[PDB]
Amino acid sequence: QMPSLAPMLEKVMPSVVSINVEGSTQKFMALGSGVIIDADKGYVVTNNHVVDNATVIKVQLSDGRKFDAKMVGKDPRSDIALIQIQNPKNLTAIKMADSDALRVGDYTVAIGNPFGLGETVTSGIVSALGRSGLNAENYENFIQTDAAINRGNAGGALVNLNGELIGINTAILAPDGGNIGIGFAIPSNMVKNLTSQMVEYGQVKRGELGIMGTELNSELAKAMKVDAQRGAFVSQVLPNSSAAKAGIKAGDVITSLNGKPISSFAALRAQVGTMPVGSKLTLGLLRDGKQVNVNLELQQSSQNQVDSSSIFNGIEGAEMSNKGKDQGVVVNNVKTGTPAAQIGLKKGDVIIGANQQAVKNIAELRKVLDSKPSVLALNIQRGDSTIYLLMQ
């Protein structure tokens, strides 16, 4: 009688699907993996970079079945995209684990589609936690593992021995485009927060404390007479920000969030970066070697805007986001001499509906384009006037 991962995998494997994609920007073809998050609705999480600029998206289960899927949401900053299987029949979803309970040394299993071979399983351990720096503009709080990960594994599952999702495989460190024992996955907690938003609104409503800062290193801790050699150093706090109102002052060092210690400023940024606006949280602070606790509430941010090419697959030069709560899709900013402004679009406009269907958020709008009508008729409102924009 031998130890084996097989019993655990029999239940878990159907939960991991593989994504095939065709797109354009000049035609291309790509492939990766995805994880079923809601069996009934057919929701499937995956990497944003796998499904970015995709005209066609098809999903293949472990048992051979093929489905077509449509984009639901996407977040370039965290590299997480949510798609939806069309006509979801008899699916199996994965249960998610609490990634905050992960320790280095814990065992891991990776499941995905390397080089299109098909559903492939590999094993390792958690090598490190809170890794970041791959792209300093992205929100990254990676789990690192030595379970083999290669091209095609992206969007695939990283699970513990109990077949619970702890992460989504996103990247590797490889000088040769081949795995050398260093892989990175997005923690499952971040996935829980980002996807649950996309499901309802079509995008993520980003919150902010309103503080500038940098990594607290040992040298900086000497200059500042601080004991801790790690944490978020508050460079400054913006006026009229939640942080200011809360009582946070510059020269402060943030050591914990909601009880959980903080690896770094980068990690902290990644935590709050995924939480919805109006979230009640609490911070551990260190000022003058004295421990402080504070109650905060996330607020509106300037990072909400997303490009129009992301929604019309080829219409560049217009950023736009949800408005208030279910009040339509307001256009944030418009660039001159671009495909968007060529049909009339101007910043300040608020899309009320399209083709006689009401539009409250980006999801409802995307739901009309999924229909793929020959002509698109937007009912926007400029100032006190209602107008229409026709496409094609």
User: What's the min distance (Å) between Cβ of 322 and its own copies?
Assistant: 37
Edge-to-edge strand ranges of the sheet holding 157-159: 120-131, 142-145, 183-187, 165-172, 157-159
Give min distance, CB of 121 to its own copies, in A.
Answer: 5
Contact 54, 20 (CB under 8 A): no
Q: Looking at 8-16, 87-95, 253-261, 280-288, which segment touches its own copies (CB under 8 A)? A: 8-16
CA distance 62 to 13: 7
Of residues 147 and 340, the one with the C-beta less far from its own copies: 147
**Applying CB under 8 A, which of residues 13, 72, 329, 330 lies at the interface with its own copies?**
13
- Helix, strand, or coil (residue 100): helix
Q: Does 156 bind its own copies (CB under 8 A)?
A: no
Residues 162-201 that bind its own copies (CB under 8 A): 162, 173-182
Phi, psi dihedral angles at 333 (to 5 degrees):
-150, 145
* Cα end-to-end span (Å), the chain: 66
3-state secondary structure of 14: helix
Identity (one letter) of the amino acid at 102?
L
User: Residue 167 Cβ, how far from its own copies at the closest point, in Å?
Assistant: 16
DSSP 201-238: HSS--B-B--EEEEE--HHHHHHTT-S-SSSEEEEEE-
SS3 category, 200: helix
Tokens read off for 277 = 């606006």
- Coil vs helix vs strand at 3: coil
- The burial class, CB within 10 Å (0-12 / 13-18 / 19+), for 301 is middle
| Positions 113 through 142 that interact with its own copies (CB under 8 A) | 114-115, 117-128, 131
Q: Which residue's CB is nearer to its own copies, number 13 or number 270? A: 13
Nearer to its own copies (CB atom), residue 160 or residue 195: 160
List the one residue from 38, 52, 106, 200 that touches its own copies (CB under 8 A): 106
Query: Is 337 a binder of its own copies (CB under 8 A)?
Result: no
Among 22, 89, 135, 161, binds its own copies (CB under 8 A): 161
Q: Using alpha carbons only, how large is the chain's radius of gyration in Å?
A: 22
Q: How far is the CB of 113 from its own copies (least distance, A)?
A: 10
| Closer by beta carbon to its own copies, 214 or else 217 | 217
Q: Count residues near its own copies (CB under 8 A).
A: 59
Query: Rule CB under 8 A: is residue 229 a binding residue for its own copies?
Result: yes
Query: CB of 177: closest distance to its own copies in angstroms?
Result: 6
Q: Residue 213 or 328: which CB sits closer to its own copies? A: 213
**Residue with structure tokens 């999924």?**
370
Closest to its own copies by CB, 201 vs 233, is 233
d(CA 210, CA 124): 39
Binding to its own copies by residue 326, rule CB under 8 A?
Answer: no
Local structure of residue 276 (DSSP, 8 states): B
| Ranges within 39-68 binding its own copies (CB under 8 A) | 60, 63-66
Is residue 7 a contact point for its own copies (CB under 8 A)? yes
Sole binder of its own copies in the list 150, 170, 189, 308 (CB under 8 A): 150
Which residues lie below 8 Å from residue 192, measured CB to CB, with a gap of 6+? Answer: 96
319 with 305: CB under 8 angstroms? yes
Query: Candidates 98-106, 232-240, 244-252, 380-388 — which segment interacts with its own copies by CB under 8 A?
Result: 98-106
- Cβ proximity to its own copies, 14 vs 328, nearer residue: 14
The amino acid occupying position 356 is Q
Of 50 and 216, CB closest to its own copies? 216
| Residues binding its own copies (CB under 8 A) | 2-10, 13, 60, 63-66, 103-107, 114-115, 117-128, 131, 144, 146-150, 160-162, 173-182, 217-219, 229-230
